[PDB]
Design a protein around this ligand. Sequence first.
Ligand SMILES: C/C(=C/COP(=O)(O)OP(=O)(O)O)CC/C=C(\C)CCC=C(CF)CF
Length: 251
Amino acid sequence: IPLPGRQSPDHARAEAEQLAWPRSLGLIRSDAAAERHLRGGYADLASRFYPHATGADLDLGVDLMSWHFLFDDLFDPRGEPEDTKQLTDQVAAALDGPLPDTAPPIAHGFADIWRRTCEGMTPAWCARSARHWRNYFDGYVDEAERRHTIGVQPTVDLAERAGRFEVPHRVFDSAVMSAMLQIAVDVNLLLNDIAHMQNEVRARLEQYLLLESCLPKVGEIYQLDTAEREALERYRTDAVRTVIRGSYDWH
Ligand SMILES: C/C(=C/COP(=O)(O)OP(=O)(O)O)CC/C=C(\C)CCC=C(CF)CF
């Protein structure tokens, strides 16, 4: 992984306060569950996925890591299709509007993350981020019956929100960026299953660099102005690179 290791300078405060949010939302209800959460290193992981984030922006990324692992654990008999989809639909419902008070705590937790994720972003970014979540939830149903259950894309999406920028949407959809994001997903997929595959990681990372060098040309093809060029650069270094490197340094 020829990418620099990076960690937010606010990582210590974020890790110290990481329990207040899942406790106030009923996701963690016992001191033993709290300790098990602390042992995951989830704020540490967020501080590496989002080194450019501090304060409330990094707390949102910590909550997202917190929520994902609390959520994934709910499928460790339910995870063996109908019962899986019954939970996912209740969570995914938060994307379409307010949840009923009867919704399980894990769904009110996602809704609180999603509410904070969208505020201040363009509606089109929200809609696209919402589709990524549905693909994530659909992946759990498909697994019960991997590029979607890993949840790399919503992690990447949060890096944009935590950095208060948006990569130009027409470059997000580009064949080049789509190939870069696929590498990020595959690399995260291989490193997690390990925790020949190492060669596949090395080959993909070498291809990742090749794809990175096309981005100056991609920017002109889509006629990026100055701000859009800087957003694309922030996306390359603070969202894609960080989701590739941060996962490795975490393990
Ligand atoms: C480490 C990792 C965990 C994802 O969980 P699993 O796919 O079930 O594997 P595991 O049982 O933990 O061995 C995969 C990569 C994680 C990320 C890219 C960030 C966490 C995932 C999110 C999805 F939404 C964060 F919200």
